[PDB]
Every structure is written in structure tokens, then in C-alpha cells.
């Protein structure tokens, strides 16, 4: 369980795939919340440079890790806790 200290929350933006992303997180030992709260450590979000998305801005200011969906996908592929900084919300794929 590489993600044992993680609590993910899938952004509203990624609602279409929330169960998939939560399941990947749980497979790696993480917990998840269905909406954002003070227990979340990692917010899964896809956005753009200088993003004005409301939920993104809110989470950003709380200092929580904001990562691309590809952070979960690649952590699962590698069975490893990959660094968050390689997977900003502006990362769209390899």
C-alpha cells in the first residue's frame, strides 16, 4: 500500500470517472472522500494554466496537493508513490 497516508477527493470536474479514480486510489491503500473536506490530502483535478475554476481555486488556497488523474493512473501502473510535482493539474498525458 504505497498510498497509505493519502485521502483523495475527485474534483467535480472529473465526476464522470469518480468511482474509477476512487477505486484506483483504494487499490493503492488510500482513502477517499466523495466531496472535499478537511481530511483530503490529494485533490484529483484536470485544468489549464491560470485556471479560474471555482473548486480548483478553493482547494489551491488551502494548500492541499492538486494532481492530475495521471498521478493515480501511473502510481497504479508502477505500484509506487510517484511524486506529486510531476503531475500538476495541467498535465494531460505523456
Structure summarized in a few sentences:
With 94 residues, the chain is α/β, with parallel strands linked by helices. It contains three helices and four strands; from the N terminus they run βαββαβα.
Q: Would you kindly provide a written description of the structure presented here, covering whatever features stand out?
A:
Belongs to the TOPBP1 family. It is found in: Nucleus; Chromosome; Cytoplasm, Cytoskeleton, Microtubule organizing center, Centrosome; Cytoplasm, Cytoskeleton, Spindle pole. This protein has 94 residues and is an alpha/beta fold. It has one domain (1-94): 3-Layer(aba) Sandwich (Rossmann fold). 30% of the residues lie in helices and 14% in strands. It has 3 helices and 4 strands; from the N terminus they run E-H-E-E-H-E-H. It has helices at residues 18-27, 54-61, 69-78, and strands spanning 7-10, 31-33, 42-44, 65-67. It has a 4-stranded parallel beta sheet with strand order 2-1-3-4, with helices on both faces. The longest helix is centred in the first third of the chain and has 10 residues, at 18-27. The chain is globular and about 35 Å long.
